[PDB]
Amino acid sequence: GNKIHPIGFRLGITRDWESRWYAGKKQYRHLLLEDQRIRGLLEKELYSAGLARVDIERAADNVAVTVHVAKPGVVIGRGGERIRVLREELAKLTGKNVALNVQEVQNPNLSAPLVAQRVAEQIERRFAVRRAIKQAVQRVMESGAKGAKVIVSGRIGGAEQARTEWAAQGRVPLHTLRANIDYGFALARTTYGVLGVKAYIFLGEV
């Protein structure tokens, strides 16, 4: 086991945080436990929308927030009937009373978190892994990207012996601290057990 998470490794440059709220040694642990409660629900439901990211800003009880999805509509609802229930679900969770914007993911095939989610689902439906991977790398590589890679864990195809399927194209320089590489990890329950899915997309350097 080697190699640091390419995001935690690139926070300095090519990659901003997912919560830009300041705090002091007395509340930080709370505002933190909160964000998690937030992402906890957001993901527990908005799964179908396909949520790549979820930023959370703050200034004082005016918890900005956002949610970058591939299919906004799923969030909104008929006119805005869903984005309503949820918007109240936030302040019912935390009597903070906060916003809840929505950014659209231009291409859901250049967001590693989705590409991962993608393959991860196929795996559960029993699609041939190698195919999915081969394909996935394509979807990513076709719609732009100077490089990409996908990794599935083991028990591939219900096998007893856990393996590790590969597949990757173009460049994916992890050692280069500037690559700007989106990384996405998707679990994948199954009748026989878990399978991990990692996704890497290299888009633009400098």
Binding site: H5, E18, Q36
Partner: protein, 60 residues
């Protein structure tokens, strides 16, 4: 984390002593950093996700 010993939230220890940090995310009771309420493991997991604001990778 034996979801039953996660009675730390009890707040009714009879004696404030028995009160013990314990992780908020894993239930991990042995490396809970006051400041984050997390255990050393998750503290490392989230920091990688950039979900812990300000928290970067130190180096010198």
């Amino acid at each position: 984390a034996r979801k039953a010993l996660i009675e730390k939230a009890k707040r009714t220890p009879k004696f404030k002593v028995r009160a013990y940090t314990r992780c908020v995310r894993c239930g991990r009771a042995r490396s809970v950093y006051r400041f984050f309420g997390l255990c050393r493991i998750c503290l490392r997991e989230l920091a990688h996700k950039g979900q812990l604001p300000g928290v970067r990778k130190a180096s010198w």
